[PDB]
Design a protein around this nucleic acid. Sequence first.
DNA 1: AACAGAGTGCGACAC
DNA 2: GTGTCGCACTCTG
Lengths: 566, 523
Amino acid sequence: PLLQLPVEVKKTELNGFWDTGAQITCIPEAFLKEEIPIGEAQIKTLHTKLQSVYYLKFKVLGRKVEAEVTTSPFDYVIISPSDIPWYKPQPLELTVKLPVQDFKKELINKANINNEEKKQLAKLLDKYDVLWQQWENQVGHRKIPPHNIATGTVAPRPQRQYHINTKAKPSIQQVIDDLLKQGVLIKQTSVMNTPIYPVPKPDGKWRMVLDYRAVNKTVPLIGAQNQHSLGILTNLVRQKYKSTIDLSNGFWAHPITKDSQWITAFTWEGKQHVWTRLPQGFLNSPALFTADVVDLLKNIPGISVYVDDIYFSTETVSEHLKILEKVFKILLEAGYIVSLKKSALLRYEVTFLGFSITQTGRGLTSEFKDKIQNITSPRTLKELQSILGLFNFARNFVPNFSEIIKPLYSLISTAEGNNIKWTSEHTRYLEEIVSALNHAGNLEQRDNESPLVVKLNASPKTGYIRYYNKGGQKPIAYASHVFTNTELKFTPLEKLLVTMHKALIKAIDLALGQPIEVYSPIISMQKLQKTPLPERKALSTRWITWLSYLEDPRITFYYDKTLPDL
Amino acid sequence: TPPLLQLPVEVKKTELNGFWDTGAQITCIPEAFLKLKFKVLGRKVEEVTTSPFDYVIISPSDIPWYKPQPLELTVKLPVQDFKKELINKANINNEEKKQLAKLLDKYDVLWQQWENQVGHRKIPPHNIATGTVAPRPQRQYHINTKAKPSIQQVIDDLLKQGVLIKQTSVMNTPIYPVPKPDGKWRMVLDYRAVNKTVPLIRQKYKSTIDLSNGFWAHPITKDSQWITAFTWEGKQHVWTRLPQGFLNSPALFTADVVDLLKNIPGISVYVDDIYFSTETVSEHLKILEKVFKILLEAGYIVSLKKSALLRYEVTFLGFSITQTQNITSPRTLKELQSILGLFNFARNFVPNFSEIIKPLYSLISTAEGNNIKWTSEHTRYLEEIVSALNHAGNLEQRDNESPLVVKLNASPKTGYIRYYNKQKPIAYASHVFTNTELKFTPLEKLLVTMHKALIKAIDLALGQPIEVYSPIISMQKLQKTPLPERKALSTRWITWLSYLEDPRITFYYDKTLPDLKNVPETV
DNA sequence: AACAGAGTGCGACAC
DNA sequence: GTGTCGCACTCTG
């Protein structure tokens, strides 16, 4: 199974894709630049442009052929099937077929559109039936040149395979046989060999990931920075109708060069196999994959893609359906497929990257709220760091989070070894955290076209910070700073100022080039510049940071006569 | 009428940039491969030799199917309307003005007719990875969505010319966008973490011709490209040329034009501008053709919009190129009081200061209230204190071995800088604020007087380190700023970042000499 | 016995 | 003191 056909043009060799939807064979423009056009016809593209028809001879699979071609936007050949009536690809048969008709039916009934709009929806999914995952372990075929992932200078030491869990050996076995049939795996001896280590899932199945740490040591990390879960969450748009589309087995769609394949080798039940697409557990497999998908969809407005999960939102369902179809088409020509089960399209609210995007705003999921009620008091340091780490996820949703978490954070230094000094008063602290997070509010998004309002204030012990959009009533996020020992000795103004400094470090990124406005209990900034030196208790290096903000043009300050306290 | 362009090549599973020269029928390729048959643009054919650089020369006789086309970007500037403006702005005699128009039109290949158009120097490419330890890759935050299509069009244009290519690198530099005056945005590359790992490298008729994006005309070697990488729309983009914001890119840029024009006397280039002056209009036009020819042959392109010529007045280095201390008397006690503070530094290095300064103290005390009476004799006793300080009073000569300390400050209408040597100063400075500068904020006033104090500083330094002392604070914070709070900077602080990234000069704030109300200099 | 990003705090050592 | 940079844990795909 090639699923890409060797095509030879002008004594050169490209790849030809057999497109049923191709009314005409296209061809890269570099080959038609010397030929004479024979006709002009409107040609269907993603963005129906009028192209010119040619007459060219070439050969596919080695057999001479010839017909009417046209210029292609890509470096590969789109093939009208009528141009090669002798060739016919066979269908696709793996192990377990999925209930794709059930996936569609489920996805429509959950859709928040009307019955007339629901019909428009139902037609669209039956139309792109070729786009949805139809078998277990079905992989797409990305039409990009293969990656050379073996960018190393020193060779890695081969690993002896260690123990595979017996409970996983049937699950991997089907995957390997399913991946072998689609050409993803190849039986091949190799210099390198790495251990296959399945990771569990909530369902009885198991994942194909491998201990690639030895290989990872000899390969440099790709420096691209295209995963920012917070930046997406804080900057996505939240109109009426929202939807998420989950790519399926995205790694296994990116081809890797043959010379780069040996580094992926692993041993399974006696024989040594070699990956052909980006394997899982490899250090550059994320950065390479997520680069391609985020590059593909950049021009789709209002979109947000995290690795293989795609969110967007519009106000009217009519536009949502147009953009949705545009997305499906871009994925299909690219060679990607979509898991319909993992995705949900058209709802007043949907959960994205661990938060629920309700019609009112970004909030904590019910699934998370159950996660935190169901914790017991910790017994070891690792347990303390897990309860702390889970709590930390929700930090932005309560005005004074950094207070109630401090008594728990302090317990890890006083603890010696893994044993910890938990008290009845300590458990009480744990309960207060959960109740505030239980009753925690709903968070706003960042208006990328409006100034950033940052309202700050401080008490003798800690300093509080809330962010808003100019005139916005619900905050984007909460923050607060516990004054350390050295900060406590500061004058009340210097406490306000070290609170402001810790805000602006964050608020500079939050503005996205917009202006910034500061509301504070400080009457005038100019009197602060001339505060007597025998009055300022903090060091001079802390006062150059604070005074520098008065010189930044992107920020102005304001006095707000609201909520003083001490 | 835009000019020709290069073509992508690839030989033996190796990606390379390729260039077309009409002359040679012998292609040449880097020798490292040759321990014949290869593809260019996708089509493949076979007669080569070795090349001087990592670049490839193609034989045009080898690829008949390829006929180059005029250069096409996204936005075409009105080249003729720029040409007529420089004609109409030329305060020169009319028949000569028409003759210059004829010369300007003759070189439609030197001017830029395309937004974000780049040139190309046939110089050997620059090895800019001259550090020893690699910079730590840097993280990136989400970009303002309104800023993306502006930057995307700029990147799309740079990709089509081959300036930017999509390549994965080990390193990564942040990118932050900033508003332009119009509705578009501008891309900034925050190369500080990169910069810290690499070693640092007049008459009647006047004119200023300004090269356009000269940085992007300098090829950089292939093994030095990885360090320039930034991540746009989730893919890493690598520069094939000197990037804006790199350390040694301004130095390597202007060092090329001064040597291009080394044989022409009287030139004065600064970063991106070119300065020439002549006695007549006949000589002025003869040098234009001489200078324009060198630029074309080398490979730059100049923007007619940003240039000015044949004017009795031009601007250059922030000043006015015209044709070919002291104060004003005080009115209230506040003016006189800020005078005493100005010269309070001099009590240390001047022997007879107490007696000269005694007039001032007596006037402040005798006249109660805010209404001061200052006799016309007091005005003359300041006339001596000015002239006494500048002439020769305890002024040490510049020591070429020691670093230079410069303390600057400004009044509302005038600016006052001074220079020491790591017991008394070297020399003094004075700037009167123009009508545009007079409307600035006191910070902005105190800021132009630093630029000007720094042009003389780099002159009087003779290469030594520099220490700047001003009432500007964020200068010193920007100098040493901890990396958790590094972040992005506002437009004004970028130009001074270029000065700041210099490991030789250091900025300080000392809090001395306030003078909010000092009467201006004499007219 | 896997990967990458985001986030947080702690903590030994630097200066 | 302020500051680096490695570690721990959590979340996301």
